Amino acid sequence: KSEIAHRFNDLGEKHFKGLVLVAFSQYLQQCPFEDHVKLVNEVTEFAKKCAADESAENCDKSLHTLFGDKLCTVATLRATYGELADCCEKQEPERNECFLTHKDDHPNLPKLKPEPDAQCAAFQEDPDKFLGKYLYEVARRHPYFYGPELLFHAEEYKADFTECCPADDKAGCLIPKLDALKERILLSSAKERLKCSSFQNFGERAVKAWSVARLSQKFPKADFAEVSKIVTDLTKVHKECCHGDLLECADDRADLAKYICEHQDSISGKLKACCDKPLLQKSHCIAEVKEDDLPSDLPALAADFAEDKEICKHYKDAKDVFLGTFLYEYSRRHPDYSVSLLLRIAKTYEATLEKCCAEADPPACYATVFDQFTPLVEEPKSLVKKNCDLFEEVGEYDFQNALIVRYTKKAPQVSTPTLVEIGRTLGKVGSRCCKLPESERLPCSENHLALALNRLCVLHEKTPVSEKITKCCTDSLAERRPCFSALELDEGYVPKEFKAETFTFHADICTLPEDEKQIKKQSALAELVKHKPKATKEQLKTVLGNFSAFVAKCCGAEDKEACFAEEGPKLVASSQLALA
Ligand SMILES: CCCCCCCCCCCCCC(=O)OC[C@H]1COP(=S)([S-])O1
């Protein structure tokens, strides 16, 4: 009858408002905070009016009609959101689609600087407005951020300030917490972005396949009914969120967490803790829940998936249920494999049955299918061993550098700041994953890689620079990582013209905290490869060694700039000779 009254009644005012603020923030990233609050308050007002007389004027309209209408009262300002104003001339669903198409994945807004004194005051004059502003700042930086999850993170941001503002040393309590919160936001956005991109680029099947694999790993005692259903509902949840239907997304998410906790014993022992919790914390806990123990009754698989006479029949009748079942069985027993590996393994099973079921004598053809998996397993296992050995030997910073060189050689057309971000991010994956118990390293490493590579692909969607990057980003979700891995130095590239000033340092660097000095040197590293792309990893290491020495010397001088001005250019010329 009235959809806006329904969702208002289901969600409650705080959540309704949060979710609407998040939605507007993602659709209209460039819009000031003030306009968004008015916009939310007005829509919220309308909802209440609709909740008490659902037959009032326009209470029967769809949400996207109401929300778009509303957005379009402010977005018409061409000055401030150019493209988006032509979205406003379209009726739904074209209009929504247009808005989605024009979301910015890299608006490059000012970095979020915690300010413990001024923020604690804001927190106290008006906490709801202060929370709203976190939602605003995060949402607009991350326009496919999981909606309801951002609300949960807003409760943690509040918790942080509630525990720190009254205490004596504010920044001491408060800054590490907020830096840790920022990890979790970055990582979570990257997780959700991967979901929406898989919808965009590959469709629903790709998402279900991914979800079946991962949910089976997580809930290996659940039988296939439970997994299947969960997958069906979680896919529908994320579909709705990716498509900007936040309110509907949050209702369906609540329904699902309720189901999962009513069927706790038939899904996983580990959900106990998650289920004796409130809505948002509950949902969150389920979504990040540890993997359950393996059951003692897992079936032999070969008996059914290799040896059985009746496979081609069991497969032609309902290939996706049959494959799903294969995928579920292989996945529940292999928490030690990455999700993408499990999918390569299933595409290989599928491929093998297409071949063998269209052949004279099929069973003799597919009797060795499980033997075709051994090489798919061994490649990433060894890749992870190798990256983890290198990381443990030399550490985060030099490991990042090595990846900066790897990726700059594969894609020297990418902008320096992006290649630095990638390499740094991937080194951070090294620090997360390589310390884990050995069987957990493959999945930690590839699943995180998938996210970083998707970030790079998304950036490439808006600023394309390399056919190689396009080729890897679009061929196939399962084949992404191995495809990036196989890129070798782009031989087409003409070395970037030497600009001495790029490699020339100054005293200003001396102020910077360690990790921003690092970024500057690593930028220079990427630029070093751009100009000398055949230089080996170790020539670059030595030259970078000499750069670091020199920065450290000159930063410790009486006259820092005289030291830089004198030595800097000698270093810059000589280091070109060292990269032949
Ligand atoms: C209605 C609920 C039914 C849930 C079970 C069905 C899920 C589909 C499982 C199919 C598995 C096929 C193997 C596979 O990995 O294919 C999906 C791939 C195809 O290319 P990508 S982009 S890697 O996704």
Author numbering: 4 to 583
Q: What does the original paper state about this entry?
A:
This binding site is located in the cleft created between helices h2-II, h3-II of subdomain IIA, and helices h8-II, h9-II of subdomain IIB, which is formed also with a contribution of the helices h5-III, h6-III of subdomain IIIA and the short loop between them. Additionally, the sn-1 oxygen of Myr-2S-cPA forms a water-mediated hydrogen bond (3.3 Å) with Glu353 and Arg208 side chains. The latter residues, together with Asp323, create a closed ‘buckle’ over the binding pocket which covers the aliphatic fragment of the ligand. The last four-carbon fragment of Myr-2S-cPA tail is protruding outside the pocket, into the solvent region. Thus, poorer electron density around the terminal fragment is understandable, due to the lack of interactions between the ligand and the protein. This binding pocket was also identified in HSA studies as FA6 and, comparing the conformation of Myr-2S-cPA and FA in this cavity, they present an analogous conformation. The shifted glutamate residue precludes Myr-2S-cPA recognition and thus binding within DS2 of ESA.
As molecules of highly lipidic character found in the circulatory system, cPAs are bound and transported by the main extracellular lipid binding protein–serum albumin. Serum albumin is a three-domain helical protein which binds up to seven medium or long chain fatty acids (FAs). Here, we present the detailed interactions between human serum albumin (HSA) and equine serum albumin (ESA) with a derivative of cPA, 1-O-myristoyl-sn-glycerol-2,3-cyclic phosphorodithioate (Myr-2S-cPA).
